[PDB]
Amino acid sequence: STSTIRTGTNNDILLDDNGNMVILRDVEACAQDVRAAMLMRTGENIFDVNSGVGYFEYIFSPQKSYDDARKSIADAILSSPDVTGIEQLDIDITGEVFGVDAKVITIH
């Protein structure tokens, strides 16, 4: 049963109306954790390093094949607890947009 502090789109601790910290559990907590994990560049953990998405070696670079980017994103999604797998992972490329869509099948 995952649980996480409530954060806004600015990725900062967002409090409630009474000035407390909200602890989301299960589905919403897992969704927020997945969104936060997909925004972490590789080599940003002093205590994991090899964890994180390849935003500068697989994406944003003249990479021949985006299968490595797909694998890195899949690993980042699966790294979150209670994720099990991914039902669908679209890696569509627009003119200058790297559109990624996930269909996580988290156990909750």
Partner: protein, 170 residues
Amino acid sequence: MLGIFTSLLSSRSFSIVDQNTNQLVAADLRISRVNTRFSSVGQRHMLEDGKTKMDSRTIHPMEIIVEVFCPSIDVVDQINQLLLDRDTLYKVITRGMVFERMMCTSEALNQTPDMISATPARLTFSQVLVQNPKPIMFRNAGDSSMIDRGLALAEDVVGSAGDLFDYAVN
């Protein structure tokens, strides 16, 4: 085979349902052939006079082999997750033939010039033999049968009685 008149023009044939959470998995597989082979062994015992008593019969676990085409990468990844999934038993419904307690044993993906978009795959499941296929449960939380844990070898802390008291006070 016949036995059921669905009278519906959209009935789905194959279904791999995760037994827990009761969810479809790998719903985009394009199945091509399914072989649900059983197995059992006799105990032929030759004895004295020209004769052989077969004794009893032991039911070996079911094997089921599914040939399929995976059209997409997410489906291939779902198949890989099925193989790597060691904690759930699946239920395979091929054609009016339901098999519970089914676990993926093998999988072979094939990539050939004969098919560049999709990938042929040969899944193989084996059944998990259980002592009681029909278990007995209870609705309410009070009335479980007692579970023994045997010897424990109680481990150690240093907290003193004062801390336990203060905790009980709080």
